[PDB]
Swiss-Prot record, chain B:
Entire protein: shown range: 62 to 257 of 306
Source organism: Mus musculus (Mouse)
Keywords linked to the UniProt accession: Mitochondrion, Ribonucleoprotein, Ribosomal protein, Transit peptide
Gene: Mrpl2
Family listed: Belongs to the universal ribosomal protein uL2 family.
Segments passing through the bilayer: none
Subunit structure and binding partners: Component of the mitochondrial ribosome large subunit (39S) which comprises a 16S rRNA and about 50 distinct proteins.
Lineage of origin: Eukaryota, Metazoa, Chordata, Craniata, Vertebrata
Lineage top rank: taxon: Eukaryota
MF terms in GO: structural constituent of ribosome
Subcellular localization: Mitochondrion
Record-given protein name: Large ribosomal subunit protein uL2m
Cellular component terms (Gene Ontology): mitochondrial inner membrane; mitochondrial large ribosomal subunit; mitochondrion; nucleoplasm
BP GO terms, sorted: mitochondrial translation; translation
From Swiss-Prot, chain D:
Subunit description: Component of the mitochondrial ribosome large subunit (39S) which comprises a 16S rRNA and about 50 distinct proteins.
Compartment list: Mitochondrion
The name this protein goes by in its record: Large ribosomal subunit protein mL37
Primary location group: mitochondrion
Alphabetical list of InterPro entries matching this protein: mtLSU_mL37 (IPR052482), Ribosomal_mL37/mL65 (IPR010793)
Pfam families, A to Z: PDCD9 (PF07147)
Biological process terms in GO annotation: mitochondrial translation
Cellular component, GO annotation: mitochondrial inner membrane; mitochondrial large ribosomal subunit; mitochondrial ribosome; mitochondrion
Keywords for this protein: Mitochondrion, Ribonucleoprotein, Ribosomal protein, Transit peptide
Protein family according to the UniProt entry: Belongs to the mitochondrion-specific ribosomal protein mL37 family.
Example of a GO MF term: structural constituent of ribosome
Swiss-Prot record, chain E:
Principal location: mitochondrion
A molecular function GO annotation: structural constituent of ribosome
Annotated GO biological process: mitochondrial translation; translation
Portion of the full sequence shown: 2 to 98 of 146
Family: Belongs to the universal ribosomal protein uL23 family.
Protein name: Large ribosomal subunit protein uL23m
The entry's keywords: Mitochondrion, Ribonucleoprotein, Ribosomal protein
Gene Ontology CC entries for this record: cytosolic ribosome; mitochondrial inner membrane; mitochondrial large ribosomal subunit; mitochondrion
Coiled coil region boundaries: none
Swiss-Prot record, chain F:
Gene Ontology CC: one annotated term: mitochondrial inner membrane
The protein, known as: Large ribosomal subunit protein mL65
Organism: Mus musculus (Mouse)
GO molecular function, one term: structural constituent of ribosome
Primary gene name: Mrps30
Signal peptide stretch: none
Subcellular compartments: Mitochondrion
Top-level taxonomy: Eukaryota, Metazoa, Chordata, Craniata, Vertebrata
Family: Belongs to the mitochondrion-specific ribosomal protein mL65 family.
Subunit structure: Component of the mitochondrial ribosome small subunit (28S) which comprises a 12S rRNA and about 30 distinct proteins.
Keywords: Mitochondrion, Ribonucleoprotein, Ribosomal protein
Keyword Coiled coil part of the UniProt annotation: no
One GO term of the biological process aspect: mitochondrial translation
Full-sequence range covered: 90 to 424 of 442
Amino acid sequence: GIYTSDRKFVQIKEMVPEFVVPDLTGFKLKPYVNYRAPAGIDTPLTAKALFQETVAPAIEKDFKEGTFDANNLEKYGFEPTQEGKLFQLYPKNFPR
Amino acid sequence: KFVSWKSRTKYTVKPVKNYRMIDFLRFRPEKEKAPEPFEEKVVVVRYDPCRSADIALVAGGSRKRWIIATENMKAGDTILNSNHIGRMAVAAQEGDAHPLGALPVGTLINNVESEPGRGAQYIRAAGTCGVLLRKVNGTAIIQLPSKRQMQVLESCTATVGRVSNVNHNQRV
Amino acid sequence: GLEEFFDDPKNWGEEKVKSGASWTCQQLRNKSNEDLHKLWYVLLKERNMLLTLEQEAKRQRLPMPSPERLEKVVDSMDNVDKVVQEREDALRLLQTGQEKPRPGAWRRDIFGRIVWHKFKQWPIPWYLNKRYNRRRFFAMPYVDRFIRLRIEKHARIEARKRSLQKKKEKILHAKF
Amino acid sequence: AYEWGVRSTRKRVYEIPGLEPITYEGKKHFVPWLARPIFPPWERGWNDPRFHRAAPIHEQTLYKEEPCYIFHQRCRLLEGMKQALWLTKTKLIEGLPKKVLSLVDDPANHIENQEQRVLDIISHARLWHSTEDIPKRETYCPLIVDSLIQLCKSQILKHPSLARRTSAQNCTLATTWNRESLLLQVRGTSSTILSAKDPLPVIASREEVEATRSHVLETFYPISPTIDLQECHVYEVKDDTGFQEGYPYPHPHTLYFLEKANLRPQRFLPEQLRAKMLLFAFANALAQARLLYGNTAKVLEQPIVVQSVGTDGRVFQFLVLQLNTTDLASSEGVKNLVWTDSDQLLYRHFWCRPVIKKKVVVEPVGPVDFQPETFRKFLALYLHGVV
Amino acid sequence: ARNVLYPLYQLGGPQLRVFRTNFFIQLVRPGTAQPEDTVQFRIPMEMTRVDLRNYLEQIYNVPVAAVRTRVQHGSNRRRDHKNVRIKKPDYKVAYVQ
Amino acid sequence: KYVVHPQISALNADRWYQSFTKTVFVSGLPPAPSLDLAALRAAVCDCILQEQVYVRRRRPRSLFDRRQALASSILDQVVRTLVNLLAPLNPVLSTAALDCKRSVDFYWLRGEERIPAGHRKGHIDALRYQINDKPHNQIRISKQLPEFVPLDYSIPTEIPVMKCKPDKLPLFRRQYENSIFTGSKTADPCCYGHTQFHLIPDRLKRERLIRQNQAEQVEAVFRANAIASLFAWTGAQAMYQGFWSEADVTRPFVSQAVITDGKYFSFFCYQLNTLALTVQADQNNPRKNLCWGSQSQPLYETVEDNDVKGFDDGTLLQIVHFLLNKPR
RNA sequence: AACUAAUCCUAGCCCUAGCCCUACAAAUAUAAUUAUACUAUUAUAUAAAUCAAAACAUUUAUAAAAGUAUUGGAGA
RNA sequence: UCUCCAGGCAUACGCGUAUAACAACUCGGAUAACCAUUGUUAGUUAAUCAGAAUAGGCAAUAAUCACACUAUAAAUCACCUAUAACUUCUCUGUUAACCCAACACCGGAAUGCCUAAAGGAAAGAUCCAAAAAGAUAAAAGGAAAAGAA
RNA sequence: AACUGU
């Protein structure tokens, strides 16, 4: 909130966080995992991996067809600006 | 980072937390008047904490302003402030502000200004009186308390009479 | 629910509670973005219940049954956070190329050291922010003497380190 | 020494054409070794009231070259009574209206144990009301007047016609009129307005109203009539009776104005209070005439009578005003008739604690030199127009 | 969420939403004698009483009538073998009806 | 000593206050000249409801007090007119004294506690309570009101009992002057009173309370304010007569009060039977204080144009019925 | 043969050699470590003296030629 | 329960867990009992108690129960006119027999209320030494009472 | 002078 004149507290609804609680009904993931389940080797996701998985197939097909141009870079997923999104990648304007 | 304590936005005659704002430009044309001679009334002779001499409240028209008190100022006295240079001798009431041209030679004066419009800066202390040593045309000689005799234009404003506490110089 | 804050009534009084292995990072990566957010709360709920039980145990001056459960949940939660962070980090780099979510730059302090300064968001610009301008990002002339001392101190640290190793080496020769 | 000018103040690379000097704007922070950047005006993206600045008066759309002089509660007239008469174009008759005096002559008007009840009310209003040993005028002054009105309001038993009037709160009165080409505005608010369904009886006949033409407003040259008024260049023309149109009690019976300041320097002088009452009472009367007869300027065939009472809890001032003309542009002609009764003391002094001198109770806890006549004069105004 | 930066709010800005919560709370048997409906909770010092109200209402669907909270000073009298004062972590006790 | 607020948001505050006061609250009103009720449906001054649209006043700067300020203006005007209108029928109103926003104070002791720690650990001290109230309006008369039930009247209902300490419910003790006040000093002839008027703040109004989930507490706020205000006010009156803890009242002291939320109106009646509330003074006392209260009821529905629609005479009749009551 | 005590070797260091150097979150110069506006923001003149001249005053160091010559209260 | 003594309670400031319960008997109290010690756990709950927009216009007349009444040491923003904003209760303080004096130092320590209903204990035991200190009593006498200069 | 174990 914000303290206005006269030493009076004025709570701001926007600045008050709202807890987004997921629905756990039908969700099969639980706090613990089976010892029967093999441990997973860590393979952290990277920009190259994300680009290869999603963006590369689109460009590869388009490039062979020849329908590739700078103006359509956004079509493959480029964002000219982070404004307009509730969650902005940079500068980070959203909380966890 | 230094700000003077005399920082009141509005000039007032009420004591200020007390200090009373004094006015040393005697002929300041008052509201609802032309830049012509105007008269004022000495409402009260009060005590000034920040000055040795006692200040007399002089009121005229719609404006009330504190001024330094001369030797014989008392409550209810009439004070005239004139810019016009009288062709003949102008009626002299102690404490009145008149051009040196109007006054005759030999009249005790105080709250004189070295240059016209400068404002009262000398003969403001208790018992200090300036003697009009000489008068010629538009020039007059005013003796300041420092013993410096200076020649100034007749337009310079001088207040008749000695300052209050006439025996300040005679203090033992 | 209130019951979720506490362990199963059947498990009460048991020496331990049977629980499996914690979530590994790769399995969480396989799970969807929505699933990851759902799982985080599930782990958090278990963590709070285990924390709730542990605090009561401290009040009762009693041991916590199966303390490894809390460690497993925390490990799973830690794995979840990095997996989600990895996806967010990758996309930010792709769209913007910035290696850090928060704007920053290298700045020199009054001591002459070069440190990464994390930028702060303000409603006013820097030039109109006197307090931000009041903050000192410039090194004084006298820091040159300190800079020489820092280089000398670094050399002194290496010299002292060799002396420390020498004393250890003495016993190695004596022992062997 | 008188100082002209605030005493506080008293004891290359850019020039190159075609090139731009480097500045620490890129650094994003000040450094003494770099040139000061040139910053264009900053845009916040929204308006902050804390950092907002009011636009100048002249830029305002409502700005008008002619000055509108507005009179409010704090305004103190230099000439006092004389200025008010000139501004309101009214003729003054000393004393209350002949009718008002006759109201209390009737024995039925006098309250049973009127003096004792007033004495009890005065003691209650001053001492018994609060637990404080010596309550201040800021508290008892509103209370005493309210208690007196209730006692007067209790007379409905004797006169059922009194049920046709009621008192409102924080009524705002305002009017705009011209005097000898001078724009004048009076703003009055606060206090209470007693309103009745019927207009107060006219005190002066039409022949007397015409006789007012002989009277001439006194002048005080060279001081302007606008002295002591708030000179306004941004203003709107408004007429206010204290109520919106449709009020079932359109006629104001009395206009009260209380001065509860404890300290005499904080209290307006008796002359100033009456001068304030005259302008405020005139404005309320003028608003009624303008609403009834429109904005046209003419002599009123049916005069409007309104009353005003001003008291500080110890001194009571009674004012009765009759509006005879709306043609106030000229200073000569039919003039409004006003009746003034001033310096009516309910009591000379009151002791809120017993005064014991030499182990003798010289003064009790009660009013000193209590005058029941003042309440009778107040009672006369309240009952006027009904009995 | 604790130990994190919260977005600065400006006029017309979005409502603040916390999709992932780092606040962890513990239900504790009341040390003092309290009404049965009243419940004591140990919560991070950075959490507000309003946050607890939303936290219980949303995450655990618990209806709350009134909340009273206190901050317990951690004793720093304890010293280690080196005579260095040890400070107990400060914790906040919340009384929720 | 504990500081007691007549208007408080604590749960079951009326029950807690009753335990501190030894008052039993029976639901409903206490056991028991034509004036054109229709004329009073409008003589009650919908005119001030008409004037709130006509009477021009400077706008409040806050913009939040506008609603609350409006309620105060109408209530004050309605009270003034009602006293005058009902004066001819009931002579008591003629001699009555009207108090506006004045303070009523009472200081009483009930129970005891053992100091848990400190230099005085283990010492026995009494539980001190103070009630300070400023009713919107109250009527003070020179003659006691007629009793609604004979003194020593006994009913099977039991006074509330509080398991926990007073501090556990939000309550704080402070050391200051102890005051017992009837709304005026003893010198005032009107040592008794007719009715008390209270206005609930916006924070405790029904709409906010329902949103806050404390819908059931709406009646509790009415009861807590009524019991605290009436008991403290009644207790001061008895003390003015010389009755204190060791000299219990020989005659029952009765009073009534009305609490309104701005639209709904509630009526409460209190009878004071015991001044001995200390453990020593109340060690063997069979008498108890009795309070009768009624549910809050709307006085109207809305006020559009320049008139009031939906005015409920029944609430006004209770005011008329209450005002017409006089001692026998 | 008893008490109080004593017993010990690594804790580490020193000098040359070698070598220049380029080693979490959150909060912070405002009141440092205070998540957003206030208030503009800023070091440093010969180094001297002490000291030696038994005090003190000009003065007083900081490869061979060679401690040769000059200089110097011709004295340290 | 008895005998006797008579600055007590709140706040400020400072202190910072010395608070409370349990468990210990080594160390701390200049001795015990018991803890102020040692270990562990608990604690102080506030919409009411406390802390954390702008531009113009305009002001003569102390207080003292403020009336009379004087005096001298000379003693008080408001409200108008415009502009801007548009629905609010979070955060923090709350324990104690406590502080400044190296010490559990016969010292220092602000304000409000009240003067016992609040708050306290001079006696480790024995003996009745001398000598010494303090207090009380004096036959006759009065420098060997409170009066004068 | 009185007063008192001076």
